[PDB]
Each structure stands twice: as structure tokens, then as C-alpha cells.
Amino acid sequence: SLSTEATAKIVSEFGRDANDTGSTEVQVALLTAQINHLQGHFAEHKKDHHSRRGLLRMVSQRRKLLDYLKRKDVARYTQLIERLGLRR
Amino acid sequence: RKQVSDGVAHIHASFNNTIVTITDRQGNALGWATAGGSGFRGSRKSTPFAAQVAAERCADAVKEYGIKNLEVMVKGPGPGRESTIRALNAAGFRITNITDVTPIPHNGCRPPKKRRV
Amino acid sequence: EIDYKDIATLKNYITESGKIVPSRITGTRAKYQRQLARAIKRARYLSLLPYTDRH
Amino acid sequence: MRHYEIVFMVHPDQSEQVPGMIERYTAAITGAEGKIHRLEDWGRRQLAYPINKLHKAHYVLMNVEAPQEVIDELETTFRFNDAVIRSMVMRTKHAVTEASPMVKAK
Amino acid sequence: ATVNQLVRKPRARK
RNA sequence: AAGGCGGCCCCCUGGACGAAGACUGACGCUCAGGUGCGAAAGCGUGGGGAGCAAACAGGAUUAGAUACCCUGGUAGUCCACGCCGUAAACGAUGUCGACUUGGAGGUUGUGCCCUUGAGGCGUGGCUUCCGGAGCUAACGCGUUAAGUCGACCGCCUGGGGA
Ligand SMILES: [Mg+2]
Ligand SMILES: [Mg+2]
Ligand SMILES: [Mg+2]
Ligand SMILES: [Mg+2]
Ligand SMILES: [Mg+2]
Ligand SMILES: [Mg+2]
Ligand SMILES: [Mg+2]
Ligand SMILES: [Mg+2]
Ligand SMILES: [Mg+2]
Ligand SMILES: [Mg+2]
Structure with missing residues (x-):
């Protein structure tokens, strides 16, 4: 996905410590930065439908992860949607 | 009339015709003989047997240059x-080099269709 | 681990006509056999091994 | 940061212009935080088959550890220069420092 | 074969 | 994922698998409409043109040759930009999970071992051929099931008409 400095920093941004890496809010941010990384790629490479399958996998994966936090704790849900620029 | 003393035999072997051609080491041709006119x-x-007399008759037209050491370049899958x-x-030469020079494409062009019989 | 620069290893793995000997004859591993294939193709561009016995 | 092995051969009539191209290309690499690992001059070497109607090509082997800044410019100036007749770069696994089998036998 | 399939549409009598 | 994918090298990028732990805490499976991909032929616009080659030209063949065979040859095959969305698109087997004697191997890892050799001993991922029980109309399948079961979806109801 990204490098070691880009991955481990965002875990420290949204996690409580360095060990808080398996939580759902980190997993949203791992997909949020990756889709934002691939904005200029698929604009130049519209004929790459095979990497688009990996793109649509991560969009569908992020949608399933937002539905779990929304059905359990809406206080943490409303924080992250504006903190990463979601809901469009 | 001229002395080269170094022969090169680009001989051809197709399924229909075999062509024997004597030339030098520098491309300048010296004589040919086909099996159609033999x-x-x-x-x-x-x-x-048509290739047995084509090589001998082509050899009789290149002894004016005094060739003793020749090279054989075999080209084609023909009999x-x-x-x-x-x-x-059998024509009185000292055979030195024999080399298969059959052209092998690296799937460059598309081959023709089958011949179903 | 394998490398294209040691051409003495590559001379033992080709023919006189520059053809690549498969792993059936030499009995080498299939892990190196894909690596030995691309290592010759590196040396084929750098004019270290001849393509055919024609030239 | 990537690890590159750069192979380029020089036209044999300009074999004295080779140490000029060694240090002019190096100063652009090392200024932008580019490391270097191997720099071996081999001299003339017999070809397995002729290229560009020539024989006895000059060979220079390199290893450059540098980011993607130099990989844009150096491949274009190889195609821009007429002394370099063949250019070839490749990505390696690690920064390596080991003599070639050509130097160890010659 | 599935009972949950026949909730949407029963068996078509000819 | 499938149709498929093959000179080399660079750049961007997708998934798969293994080892050691840490971490979230059922976040899962499945899918009617909907969405996208999707062999080749063909279509629209503009390039490109070797070789091969519908239609067609010519010559043999023949009762006639329309086909076969041979000499040529346009569209098309190539690229960009779209559209078309059908195939014997087949493993003729929808997906997921759980178990049930096993071999010949291949591929890809990893752990330990007089390293006493690229070996010995284990142990996961993928894959082919045999074959027991069992199943099956037979053919055959048979730890990758077409064995025993669960979860959900599609589809079939004599042939022809179609
Ligand atoms: Mg990866
Ligand atoms: Mg806990
Ligand atoms: Mg048309
Ligand atoms: Mg025709
Ligand atoms: Mg067209
Ligand atoms: Mg159909
Ligand atoms: Mg079958
Ligand atoms: Mg039995
Ligand atoms: Mg069986
Ligand atoms: Mg009916």
C-alpha cells in the first residue's frame, strides 16, 4: 500500500498507542489514504480494468467497515467522517 | 582467368527443387545449377538423384577459378x-566446412493455412 | 543469488547454437530454471552470448 | 530508496572520453543524496555478435543507489548521446558491493 | 430445491 | 474472478501465499433488480499496412467448381477513440464452510538436524495422475467429490414448433 513511514504514522495518529493497529478506525484510514493515492493513477490509466478491481475491492471494504462503527457507536462515527472528509 | 582458391557452397533444399550455388567468401557468385534444367x-x-547431378555440373563451371578448399552451407529442410x-x-574437392544455414524465424510472421488432403 | 555476469556458468547451460538447455537434461531445480532463463536474456542484450550458430 | 545496476557501453572510437562521463554523471547523483557502490572500467571487449557495424566494445559496469530523480534524466542523456550505443538499467534487491567476474579474472 | 426460493415464486403448475 | 496472459528493461499499480507476534472483537456468508469486466468476428471516426487472408481475379480439378489445390488480392487482422456484450465463454460441475483411509509426483515456502552434499526429519499454499470405503443410470467421481451435511442464489418440466 504505502511505505513504512506513511503506514506507521497514521496508526499513531488515530490509535491510542503503537499497538492500536487492528482497530476499525485505523483500517478505514488505511483505505482512505490509498483511494486518495490512486486518484491520479486511474485518471491516466482508465484502460487498467484489472487494478480497478483492486480499487473497487477497497471501496467496498471501506463501506462495510463504516457500517460497523455506525451501528455500534455513533459518537466515534461522526468524528472520523469529517476528520477524513467522508459522506460527500 | 581469376584465382580465388576459397569456395562457399550455398546449396538450397526445398520440397520441390534443390539448387546448388557456388560463391566466394565475399558474396560474389561464381555459378549455379538447378534440378529443373538437369x-x-x-x-x-x-x-x-537430381541433386547428385546438380552439384557435379555446377562444379564443372567453377573449376576455372582453381578452388580446392570450399565451404558447404546447407539451407532448407528439403530432401x-x-x-x-x-x-x-566426387568432383575432386577438399571438403572443409559444413554448416546448416536454414532460416529460422522467431515467430516473426504468421504461417499460411493447412493443406488438408 | 544467481547472476548473469558469471558467463562460465552460462556456457555450461547453453548449446553450441546458443539454445537454452532445459532442466530435463541438466537436472537442475525449477526455481533456478526460470532465473537462468532471464539471466541469459540479460546477457543476450549485452552481446555476451550469441543467439544462433548462424552469426 | 531503490538500488540500481546501470550497464552502458561506449563507442570504441571515443574510449578516452569515458572518465569524463564517469565524474560528470556522478556529481549529479551524489548531490541529490545518491550513493555509489561499484565503478569498474573494463576496457575493450570482444562482442559475441556485431552491433552497429563495430567490434571490440568498451564496457563500464556501475551500481547506483539513488532516488527516482536521476532515473529520468540519465536514460534520456544516454539516448541523446551518440557515444553510448546501448543503455540498460535494472532494479536489484539490495545495495551490493562485490567485484565482477571480469575484474577477478583480469 | 430450497424452501426459501419458493417463498419468492412457488412451483409452476402446468 | 473469468475471457485470458509470453523478448528484454524502466516507471505506476493490483491481488495471492508463508513465518513470528501484536491488535479490532462476528465486523460474517450469500445475493433478485442494479453495476462493471468480458475470446474473436462485425460497426462508427481518424490513422497504419509487411505477412496472412472473407468477397473477388486467374489457372487446374470436374458432370458443373461455386469449394478443395495453386498464383494473386480488398475489407479485416495493427493503433487511438467509442460502440456491439454474443461463444463448445467447458472443469459441459454457482459460491462459502465443516468433516471422512490414502499413493505417484510437480510447484512454492518455512521449522529443526553428526550444515557432516544441492541432503535427513517435519510442516502450510497451489496442482495433475491413480485408487479404497461410499456415491452414481453407466461412464466415472472419490480429501481440489460427482462421499456424508449446512447457508443462500440461479435454472429445468416430452421432442419439434422455438
Ligand atoms: Mg504487494
Ligand atoms: Mg481485547
Ligand atoms: Mg463497416
Ligand atoms: Mg482464399
Ligand atoms: Mg475497423
Ligand atoms: Mg449462450
Ligand atoms: Mg473433461
Ligand atoms: Mg474400489
Ligand atoms: Mg479417482
Ligand atoms: Mg415446451
Whole structure:
């Protein structure tokens, strides 16, 4: 996905410590930065439908992860949607 | 009339015709003989004995240059590959090099269709 | 681990006509056999091994 | 940061212009935090088959550890220069420092 | 074969 | 994922698998409409043109040759930009999970071992051929099931008409 400095920093941004890496809010941010990384790629490479399958996998994966936090704790849900620029 | 003393035999071997051609080491041709004009037409042209007399008659037209050491370049999958080399030794030459120079494409062009019979 | 620069190893793995000997004859591993294939193709561009016996 | 092995051969009539191209290309690499690992001059070497109607090509082997800044410019100036007749770069696994089998035998 | 399939549409009598 | 994918090298990028732990805490499976991909032929616009080659030209063949065979040859095959969305698109087997004697191997890892050799001993991922029980109309399948079961979806109801 990204490098070691880009991955481990965002875990420290949204996690409580360095060990808080398996939580759902980190997993949203791992997909949020990756889709934002691939904005200029698929604009130049519209004929790459095979990497688009990996793109649509991560969009569908992020949608399933937002539905779990929304059905359990809406206080943490409303924080992250504006903190990463979601809901469009 | 001229002395080269170094022969190169680009001999051809197709399924229909075998062509014996003597040349030098620098591309300048010295003589040729085909199996079509050697008294062999059609099915008789596609015989290994036709290649036995084509190499001998082409050799009789290149002894004016005094060639003793020649090179054999075999080109093609056609029959008569053995009958044309023994005919060069039957003409009084010192055989030195034999080399298969058959062109092999690296799937460059598309081959033609099948011949179903 | 394998490398294209040691051409003495590559001379033992080709023919006189520059053809690549498969792993059936030499009995080498299939892990190196894909690596030995691309290592010759590196040396084929750098004019270290001839393509055919024609030239 | 990537690890590159850069192979380029020089036209044999300009074999004295080779140490000029060694240090002019190096100063652009090392200024932008580019490391270097191997720099071996081999001299003339017999070809397995002729290229560009020539024989006895000059060979220079390199290893450059540098980011993607130099990989844009150096491949274009190889195609821009007429002395370099063949250019070839490749990505390696690690920064390596080991003599070639050509130097160890010659 | 599935009972949950026949909730949407029953078996078509000819 | 499938149709498929093959000179080399660079750049961007997708998934798969293994080892050691840490971490979230059922976040899962499945899918009617909907969405996208999707062999080749063909279509629209503009390039490109070797070789091969519908239609067609010519010559043999023949009762006639329309086909076969041979000499040529346009569209098309190539690229960009779209559209078309059908195939014997087949493993003729929808997906997921759980178990049930096993071999010949291949591929890809990893752990330990007089390293006493690229070996010995284990142990996961993928894959082919045999074959027991069992199943099956037979053919055959048979730890990758077409064995025993669960979860959900599609589809079939004599042939022809179609
Ligand atoms: Mg990856
Ligand atoms: Mg806990
Ligand atoms: Mg049209
Ligand atoms: Mg035709
Ligand atoms: Mg067209
Ligand atoms: Mg159909
Ligand atoms: Mg079958
Ligand atoms: Mg039995
Ligand atoms: Mg069986
Ligand atoms: Mg009916």
C-alpha cells in the first residue's frame, strides 16, 4: 500500500498507542489514504480494468467497515467522517 | 582467368527443387545449377538423384577459378541433403566446412493455412 | 543469488547454437530454471552470448 | 530508496572520453543524496555478435543507489548521446558491493 | 430445491 | 474472478501465499433488480499496412467448381477513440464452510538436524495422475467429490414448433 513511514504514522495518529493497529478506525484510514493515492493513477490509466478491481475491492471494504462503527457507536462515527472528509 | 582458391557452397533444399550455388567468401557468385534444367521435371525434380547431378555440373563451371578448399552451407529442410555433399567429393574437392544455414524465424510472421488432403 | 555476469556458468547451460538447455537434461531445480532463463536474456542484450550458430 | 545496476557501453572510437562521463554523471547523483557502490572500467571487449557495424566494445559496469530523480534524466542523456550505443538499467534487491567476474579474472 | 426460493415464486403448475 | 496472459528493461499499480507476534472483537456468508469486466468476428471516426487472408481475379480439378489445390488480392487482422456484450465463454460441475483411509509426483515456502552434499526429519499454499470405503443410470467421481451435511442464489418440466 504505502511505505513504512506513511503506514506507521497514521496508526499513531488515530490509535491510542503503537499497538492500536487492528482497530476499525485505523483500517478505514488505511483505505482512505490509498483511494486518495490512486486518484491520479486511474485518471491516466482508465484502460487498467484489472487494478480497478483492486480499487473497487477497497471501496467496498471501506463501506462495510463504516457500517460497523455506525451501528455500534455513533459518537466515534461522526468524528472520523469529517476528520477524513467522508459522506460527500 | 581469376584465382580465388576459397569456395562457399550455398546449396538450397526445398520440397520441390534443390539448387546448388557456388560463391566466394565475399558474396560474389561464381555459378549455379538447378534440378529443373538437369533433365528432371516435376516428380523427377523432387528426387535426391537430381541433386547428385546438380552439384557435379555446377562444379564443372567453377573449376576455372582453381578452388580446392570450399565451404558447404546447407539451407532448407528439403530432401537430398546427403546426395549433394557426396557429389562435391566426387568432383575432386577438399571438403572443409559444413554448416546448416536454414532460416529460422522467431515467430516473426504468421504461417499460411493447412493443406488438408 | 544467481547472476548473469558469471558467463562460465552460462556456457555450461547453453548449446553450441546458443539454445537454452532445459532442466530435463541438466537436472537442475525449477526455481533456478526460470532465473537462468532471464539471466541469459540479460546477457543476450549485452552481446555476451550469441543467439544462433548462424552469426 | 531503490538500488540500481546501470550497464552502458561506449563507442570504441571515443574510449578516452569515458572518465569524463564517469565524474560528470556522478556529481549529479551524489548531490541529490545518491550513493555509489561499484565503478569498474573494463576496457575493450570482444562482442559475441556485431552491433552497429563495430567490434571490440568498451564496457563500464556501475551500481547506483539513488532516488527516482536521476532515473529520468540519465536514460534520456544516454539516448541523446551518440557515444553510448546501448543503455540498460535494472532494479536489484539490495545495495551490493562485490567485484565482477571480469575484474577477478583480469 | 430450497424452501426459501419458493417463498419468492412457488412451483409452476402446468 | 473469468475471457485470458509470453523478448528484454524502466516507471505506476493490483491481488495471492508463508513465518513470528501484536491488535479490532462476528465486523460474517450469500445475493433478485442494479453495476462493471468480458475470446474473436462485425460497426462508427481518424490513422497504419509487411505477412496472412472473407468477397473477388486467374489457372487446374470436374458432370458443373461455386469449394478443395495453386498464383494473386480488398475489407479485416495493427493503433487511438467509442460502440456491439454474443461463444463448445467447458472443469459441459454457482459460491462459502465443516468433516471422512490414502499413493505417484510437480510447484512454492518455512521449522529443526553428526550444515557432516544441492541432503535427513517435519510442516502450510497451489496442482495433475491413480485408487479404497461410499456415491452414481453407466461412464466415472472419490480429501481440489460427482462421499456424508449446512447457508443462500440461479435454472429445468416430452421432442419439434422455438
Ligand atoms: Mg504487494
Ligand atoms: Mg481485547
Ligand atoms: Mg463497416
Ligand atoms: Mg482464399
Ligand atoms: Mg475497423
Ligand atoms: Mg449462450
Ligand atoms: Mg473433461
Ligand atoms: Mg474400489
Ligand atoms: Mg479417482
Ligand atoms: Mg415446451
